[PDB]
Structure formats: structure tokens, C-alpha cells
Amino acid sequence: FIQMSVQRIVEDAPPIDLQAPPRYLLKFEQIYLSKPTHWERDGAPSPMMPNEARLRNLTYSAPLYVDITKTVIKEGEEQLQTQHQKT
Amino acid sequence: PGFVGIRFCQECNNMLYPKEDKENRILLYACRNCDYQQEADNSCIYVNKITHEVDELTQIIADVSQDPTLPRTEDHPCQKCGHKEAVFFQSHSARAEDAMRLYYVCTAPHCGHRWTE
């Protein structure tokens, strides 16, 4: 599931096109996964070990990131393709 | 008599239905969407075999001689080629009440002779 199905689900999703004229694409490209991590208020990273998750009643989970490319077309088929990485 | 198949129009390839020649008293198979017609030869437009005396040997296929889960015997050599080994089995088909009868198939490749005893 982690290694194949998440990427398949993301890629199979139809890109979203919006009309207010200007139009947008917003295609999701590739997924990244970090290791299970906890941040306190300080925000300093630390690996969340399962025993700490049991003791502090945390969820043992990993953050999921995706590459998103946004393109805008208004006139003259001018492409404003911009890419947001690790969203 | 046996079952009477169906005929297809030579033009539209649709099913031909039976009609009679009122003036000539002859049986015709006549299309119903086009205007094709034909002269029948069987004269039997319908059959219904209640007793269902159907031959199970016709349905057996010789490939079952390759099934490793079938029992094999060396006491019923096949007439067609005299090979000594055969597989045997029952009919296992609905419309078979006294279905404990055995059927035999020769295991020699390229013979595939089916029979009963």
C-alpha cells in the first residue's frame, strides 16, 4: 500500500481545472514519505519511537508530501507553469 | 428426428422462420425483416425430447485423459487402438439420475476414444 497504492491513487486522480478567462491545471506528480517524527512547540525534529507513542498517547505516523505543478493560462496561450515541491 | 436447428437469411443473416405455401402446400423458411425465402427439407419445425435421451459420449472431450485427478484403469483396453490404459469417471450432469454409470477415455495421445460399458 505505501510503496505502490498511494502513488497510483494520486496519479489516477483527474487534474482539477477551474474557470472563473483564466484557467488552472494543478497536477499532482510524485509522493514522498518521511519517517515517523514528532515536533514539540520548539519545532526541533526528533524520531517518534513507538514506545514514546504508547506512553504519551501519540499517533505513530509519517508525513506525506507531494509535488504539485500549477499552470495558469489567460490569453495568448501563455503558460505560467509553476511547481510547488514537497507539499 | 432430433433437434431442428435454425436457419439464417442469406441476405441479412437474420433468423429464418417457417412459413407454408398456401397455394402449393410446401414448407418455406422465410425471413421476417427482409423478403428472402427458402424451401425446407426436414418438414419437422419443432422437437421436444421429454425423456431427454441425450448421449453423454458426445459431450465428453478427449482432453480429460490429461487430468491427473482422474482414476486410471488397466482392465478396459480401448477397441480403436488397443491401448491398455484409460481414465474413467461419471457424468455429473443434471438430467442424470442413474448417473453412477462410468465413462472411459483412452489415455494414448492422438486416440481419444470414448466409450461406455
Partner: protein, 154 residues
């Protein structure tokens, strides 16, 4: 008997004593060109597009690749030096020593398969030998798309 007369060149081979079929595992690679530090072209795959999975694959490819180089001995003679050595042990087992990494070599009979060695000559293939045994390599011991910890929460 339709006699088809074909003029084909005689291929003189030397297949030594033992011929083994080898399916290289994904972690072992062969570089056929000789290693010359001056002429050694590196992969240098685009840093950018690699993922942690690719990097572990690249690292494993650098250390576990069979290479050979030409070194000049003191007397100027070109001696071919290999980076891999196969040791025949007294018990009959073979281990592949690649640098410091040891891979166990298993001799398995290619039962059931009919792998033959042929040589392509012109428009035909000339048979040379039949593959009887397959070698499989395994690291001798267990002791032989991810991302790094995000610096800030999200």
C-alpha cells in the same frame, strides 16, 4: 536428401573446464570497461531526480561492482588486476570476495530448464555448451522515496 551447401567460418572456442549460468542479482553489477582512474566515467545521475531508494541502489552499485584495471608493475609489465576473487574452499563451497564483501556461491543444478550456449555466426547460431549448473550469490551474513526528518512541524 536436399543438399544445402553452406560455407560457414569455423569458430575455435576454449570453454575451459566448468561453465556456470549466472543470473546477476539486482545488487551486483558488471562493468566491462577497464577501470582507469583517468578515463573512469562516473554515473553522475542527476542528483535531483534520485530518491533515497535510488541512492541506496547507487551506493550498493559502487562498492559491489566487479572491475578490472591495468597496473604497471615495477618492471613496466602490464599486469591485469581484478577487484574480485573466487575462492574454492576445502569443503567444496565457493564464496565470492568483492573487496571486503563476501557473497556465498551456491551450485544449483538447472533441473528442468534447457539453457544452451550458442555463438552467433553470420545468419546462424553455433552451439558451444549446455548450461548444467546455476550459481546464485548471497551476502554471507546479515552483518555484511523516503525523506529526512523535516526540520519544522507541518
Amino acid at each position: 536428401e536436399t543438399r544445402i551447401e553452406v560455407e560457414i567460418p569455423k569458430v575455435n572456442t576454449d570453454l575451459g573446464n566448468d561453465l556456470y549460468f549466472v543470473k546477476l542479482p539486482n545488487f551486483l553489477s558488471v562493468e566491462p570497461r577497464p577501470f582507469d582512474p583517468q578515463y573512469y566515467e562516473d554515473e553522475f545521475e542527476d542528483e535531483e531526480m534520485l530518491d533515497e531508494e535510488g541512492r541506496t541502489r547507487l551506493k550498493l552499485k559502487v562498492e559491489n561492482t566487479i572491475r578490472w584495471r591495468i597496473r604497471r608493475d615495477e618492471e613496466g609489465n602490464e599486469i591485469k588486476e581484478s577487484n574480485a576473487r573466487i575462492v574454492k574452499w576445502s569443503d567444496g563451497s565457493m564464496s565470492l570476495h568483492l573487496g571486503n564483501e563476501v557473497f556465498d556461491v551456491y551450485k544449483a543444478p538447472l533441473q528442468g530448464d534447457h539453457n544452451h550456449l550458442f555463438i552467433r555466426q553470420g545468419t546462424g547460431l553455433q552451439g558451444q555448451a549446455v548450461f548444467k549448473t546455476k550459481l546464485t550469490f548471497r551476502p554471507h551474513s546479515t552483518d555484511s522515496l523516503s525523506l529526512a526528518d523535516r526540520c519544522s512541524k507541518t
